[PDB]
Structure 1
Amino acid sequence: HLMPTLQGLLDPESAHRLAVRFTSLGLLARFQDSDMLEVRVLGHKFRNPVGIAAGFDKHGEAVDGLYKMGFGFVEIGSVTPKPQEGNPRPRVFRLPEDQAVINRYGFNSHGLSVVEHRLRARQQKQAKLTEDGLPLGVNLGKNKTSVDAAEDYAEGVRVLGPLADYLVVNVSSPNTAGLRSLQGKAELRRLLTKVLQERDGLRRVHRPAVLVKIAPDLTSQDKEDIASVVKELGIDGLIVTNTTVSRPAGLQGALRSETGGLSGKPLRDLSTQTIREMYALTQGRVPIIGVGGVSSGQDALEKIRAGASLVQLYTALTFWGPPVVGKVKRELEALLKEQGFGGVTDAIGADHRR
């Protein structure tokens, strides 16, 4: 009621900005996480497997409010090396009839320096949160006018790697020209070699896991190549998936033909299937964070059974608000019991074993 009014009254970008402000100020979880929901992966304990996806808190302003909302882990970003404004407005669109969003933000970012200082101000608070099962991820992007993509990512590793439990090499935004070509075998191998070199140069207690975030629009060859490179280099994990440049048949929203990445329900099963493929291609040995269209416990469990160790959501929050977090968790716990799993861990990749 208070949300859909403010959102019927505000364009989506204004609604987002207000949501970040409200969350950051702690104006918002009764659900107490069961032991069944704990997952150990990426060198950390996660008190529950439901995280906030990149894009909600691009600049690291609302991290504590997000844990208060009940997220088991928080991912901020994408952060670019230099500040940049992103695309001109309007650049985000609701498709309410589809429970979907289309965005073309183009990596609006306060930049590494601003985010560094913001995280440093709460660095020991985060260390305690991480030890308590509430890790922090930092998602790295590249500036629009950058003439060396790998150096942009390297800079991100150097500056924010020491403040993160995991880093994400985001090579799958549909809204930065040329970016998704970095998912190609040769480009990815070169980029990730550099990224891992830089990460390995950080002092041990400041050395994050490194994950690569991939698109839902990849060819079979692209997926096979990514799997090969991830295994060759010892990449720590995959985030599967970013938004889709596809427009599935059946979309009803008036704004369905806006340029950008599509998120929410129409992406859900395309993302699940991409998780399934990547888990198989990596022999279940590479942790996957599953994302795209999660709005229920069933949605979460489907991705977990397909191979995700953790899941994330964003678009569901924009429709259902903060209560969706607890809802997903409570539903997930109930389904795990119904399906005879002792916990989340037992369900990871379960579809591949039946």
Structure 2
Amino acid sequence: DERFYAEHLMPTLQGLLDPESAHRLAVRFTSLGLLPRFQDSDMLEVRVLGHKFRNPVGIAAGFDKHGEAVDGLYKMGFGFVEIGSVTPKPQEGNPRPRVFRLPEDQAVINRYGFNSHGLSVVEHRLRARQQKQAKLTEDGLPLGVNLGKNKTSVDAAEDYAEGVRVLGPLADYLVVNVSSPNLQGKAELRRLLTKVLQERDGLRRVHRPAVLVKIAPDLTSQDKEDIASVVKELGIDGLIVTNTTVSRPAGLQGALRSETGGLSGKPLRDLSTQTIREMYALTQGRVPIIGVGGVSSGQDALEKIRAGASLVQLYTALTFWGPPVVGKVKRELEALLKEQGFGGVTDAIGADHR
């Protein structure tokens, strides 16, 4: 069943379809609940900032950009779902092809360019299931919403504020995405996050989400220091670490390795894990981190948890392994936690800094 997807059904779909087309079909299948069938280990439960997560494996932003398949993503086994990026006004993104497969590297390059249905459409989609989500979140399945700016946009801070106001009420956490491959200084990021956090605080208590920043793996050491400073200063709720990389590590073998765009998957794994490690030390383990980048196995997840991530996201591994990947990562993560003498996931967060 997991062997069937990895060895036969998934390679066949890839052989028959352009990646963006296959992305669209995946979303359709998931939206209709056409999914295969592991559940409910108490070791895997984690309570980040008080909110409780049933397992720590979520679907990264970008797969369900417009909130069309949220329920089917929970049905796949994910412990939380993140949708987006959503831009305020609708925009078409970049011309096609804009998604490229690097199978020799177990990697993807994409330059979607924030194709977004827009805040209004996503709002209605989320409003159509708002009370369903309330009960889901209560039973350990929270929802996150990832916000972008429009490309023709004038005030970037205004775009993120609109997102906070329109979609903040529907979200358990919000993500200010400032790390798309397709900002000036520390004082500029302080001005943006201060506006975002102010709009957030103006929402009613039961509609007041956590606010996380999502950062690139391509930051200089000074950028990471600056983010860490502003994050602790302004009381940002967390970090998502990392987005895709505009770097092109050596030894990438795919023919399409020189396409412009963000590289995801295995070649990002350890670069992503080292940024977690770095951001966790700079914030004294005081800020929750969702680790994302190249994760496709228990060991990939545990390395990021030991590095300081309280939760992990994946995306690219789903395009190779199919929906069975979620069960696989969960099953392995529980086995290695035991093996290594951890009581649960919470016992392991940051365990590498002792």
TM-score by length of 1: 0.97
What's the CA shift for 1:321?
0.6
What is the CA deviation profile of residues 210-256 of structure 1, one whole-angstrom value per residue up to 9, with x for unaligned ones?
00000000000000000000000000000000000000001000000
Report the counterpart of residue 324 of structure 1 in structure 2: 325
Distance 1:307 1:171 in 2: 21
The answer to whether the Cα contact below 8 Å between 2:59 and 2:314 also exists between their aligned partners in 1 is yes
What's the CA shift for 1:33?
2.2
Distance 2:322 2:50 in 1: 31
The answer to whether the Cα contact below 8 Å between 1:38 and 1:344 also exists between their aligned partners in 2 is yes
Distance 1:32 1:242 in 2: 29
Distance 1:114 1:324 in 2: 30
What's the CA shift for 1:7?
1.8
Report the counterpart of residue 110 of structure 1 in structure 2: 117
What is the CA deviation profile of residues 96-136 of structure 1, one whole-angstrom value per residue up to 9, with x for unaligned ones?
00000000000000000000000000000000000000000
How much is the aligned-residue C-alpha RMSD, in angstroms? 0.8
The answer to whether the Cα contact below 8 Å between 1:161 and 1:206 also exists between their aligned partners in 2 is yes
Distance 1:285 1:126 in 2: 28
The answer to whether the Cα contact below 8 Å between 1:184 and 1:226 also exists between their aligned partners in 2 is no
How many percent of aligned residue pairs carry the same amino acid? 100
Note the 1:17-36 alignment, pairs <5 A. Answer: 17-28=24-35, 30-36=37-43
Distance 1:30 1:257 in 2: 38
Partner secondary structure for residue 71 of structure 2: helix
Partner secondary structure for residue 256 of structure 1: coil
User: In the superposition, relative to structure 1, how do residues 117 and 101 fare at CA in structure 2: closer, same or farther (>3 Å)?
Assistant: same
What's the CA shift for 1:29?
6.2
Partner secondary structure for residue 336 of structure 2: helix
Distance 1:184 1:321 in 2: 40
What's the CA shift for 1:183?
7.1
User: In the superposition, relative to structure 1, how do residues 183 and 19 fare at CA in structure 2: closer, same or farther (>3 Å)?
Assistant: farther
The answer to whether the Cα contact below 8 Å between 1:166 and 1:209 also exists between their aligned partners in 2 is yes
User: In the superposition, relative to structure 1, how do residues 288 and 44 fare at CA in structure 2: closer, same or farther (>3 Å)?
Assistant: same
What's the CA shift for 1:184?
3.2
Distance 1:56 1:30 in 2: 20
Unmatched runs of 5 consecutive residues or more in structure 1: 176-181
Distance 1:44 1:70 in 2: 18
What is the CA deviation profile of residues 299-340 of structure 1, one whole-angstrom value per residue up to 9, with x for unaligned ones?
000000000000000000001111110000000000000000
Distance 1:47 1:318 in 2: 24
The answer to whether the Cα contact below 8 Å between 1:172 and 1:183 also exists between their aligned partners in 2 is no
What's the CA shift for 1:187?
1.4
The answer to whether the Cα contact below 8 Å between 2:37 and 2:76 also exists between their aligned partners in 1 is no
What's the CA shift for 1:43?
3.4
Q: What count of residue pairs does the alignment treat as equivalent?
A: 347
The answer to whether the Cα contact below 8 Å between 2:76 and 2:323 also exists between their aligned partners in 1 is yes
Distance 1:183 1:68 in 2: 41
Unmatched runs of 5 consecutive residues or more in structure 2: 1-7
What is the CA deviation profile of residues 18-77 of structure 1, one whole-angstrom value per residue up to 9, with x for unaligned ones?
000000100006511200000101431000000000000000000000000000000000
The answer to whether the Cα contact below 8 Å between 1:55 and 1:78 also exists between their aligned partners in 2 is yes
> Which of 38, 41, 44 is residue 37 of structure 1 equivalent to?
44
1:154 aligns with 2:161: yes
Partner secondary structure for residue 183 of structure 1: coil
What is the CA deviation profile of residues 254-299 of structure 1, one whole-angstrom value per residue up to 9, with x for unaligned ones?
0000000000000000000000000000000000000000000000
Note the 1:244-283 alignment, pairs <5 A. Answer: 244-283=245-284
Distance 1:163 1:77 in 2: 13
